[PDB]
Each structure stands twice: as structure tokens, then as C-alpha cells.
Scaffold this active site. Sequence first.
Site, PDB file in Angstrom:
ATOM      1  N   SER B 109       0.767  -1.206   0.000  1.00 50.53           N
ATOM      2  CA  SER B 109       0.000   0.000   0.000  1.00 50.53           C
ATOM      3  C   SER B 109       0.820   1.290   0.000  1.00 50.53           C
ATOM      4  CB  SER B 109      -0.997   0.029   1.164  1.00 50.53           C
ATOM      5  OG  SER B 109      -0.304   0.308   2.335  1.00 50.53           O
ATOM      6  N   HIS B 162       2.745   5.056   4.285  1.00 47.70           N
ATOM      7  CA  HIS B 162       1.565   5.513   3.558  1.00 47.70           C
ATOM      8  C   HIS B 162       1.748   6.912   2.982  1.00 47.70           C
ATOM      9  CE1 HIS B 162      -1.305   2.390   5.469  1.00 47.70           C
ATOM     10  NE2 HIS B 162      -0.611   1.910   4.430  1.00 47.70           N
TER      11      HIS B 162
END
Lengths: 4, 179
Positions: B109, B162
Site C-alpha cells: 500500500s 503511507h
Amino acid sequence: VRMA
Amino acid sequence: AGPVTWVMMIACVVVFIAMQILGDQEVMLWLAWPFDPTLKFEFWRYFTHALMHFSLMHILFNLLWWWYLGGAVEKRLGSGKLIVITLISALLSGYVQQKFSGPWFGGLSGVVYALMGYVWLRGERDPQSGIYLQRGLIIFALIWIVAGWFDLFGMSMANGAHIAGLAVGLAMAFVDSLN
């Protein structure tokens, strides 16, 4: 654990 | 969907299976960011953290996004660009992650955030190059970013990975649009  | 998009899905699956069979810790031991000085030369580890998922929602969401955004990038811009977006985000997200939190983290991610920032910012600043995040999907991306930030998900979130991932993707769309 860290996700991503 | 192109080969890079595909092999990454395959590898994430093989790795996920391996995690179910051997256990998470056993696979982390081989694939995590170096968590000991002896492991510093094991070059794969700066990347392979991206390959590990720790729950079915983790792998499923990350791969759906990957499939769509990754696959957009690969078809419109080519296999080479996706490889480079991936290596950069993986390595950079990984670096920021471990700085904040330690070597114990995994997931595609960091990279998916790179692909969100990249596709959007490049579609805004470069429309004709064929890449855009449709208004509607930008909203669902934006919510995705938000859920991460505020720790909604029910997961423990790799916070560094992230943002670093998103920055990288924006930095790269920036650099790529200006041409």
C-alpha cells in the site's frame, strides 16, 4: 505489525 | 492487464499462501526490511516487505487498487514506468516506515498510495498523456487516504509507509508532467  | 501488473499479483498471492502455511513471522524473517545488521546486505529486503499481507482485507484491497491503477499505468505509460514507480515507492515507503516505527511492517500500500497520487496529479497537470483518476474514484481514493490517517481500518497502520508512498507518487507525477 503495521500494515501498509 | 500487463505482465508487471500480473506478476506482482501472482507474487503477492504466492507470498500470502506462504504466510498462511508457514506463519507470518516465518515469512517476515525472510522478507522484512533488515531488522539486524547481519541482514543489511540482503538487498531484496528493501523491497520485499511490499509483498507481505497480514489479513485478507489487506491483500484484497491493496490488489484491487493495484490491479486498476497499476494496470492503468502499465497500459497507457508502459511496463517500464510501473516498475520504476514500484521500486521507488517500495524502497522509500519502507525507509520512512522503519524510521518512525521499526522494521516490522509489510503491504503493497505504500505503492498503492504512490499510484493514487501519481495517476491523479498527472491527470490534473498533464491531461492528454491519457492518465487520470476519474472524479468519482478520486473521492474513494481520498477516503482511503483518510481512513489510513485516522486509523479507521481496524488494522494497525504503517503510517510512514503511507505518506512516503503518496509523496513519492506526487513527486513523480510532478516531475513527469512538466516535460
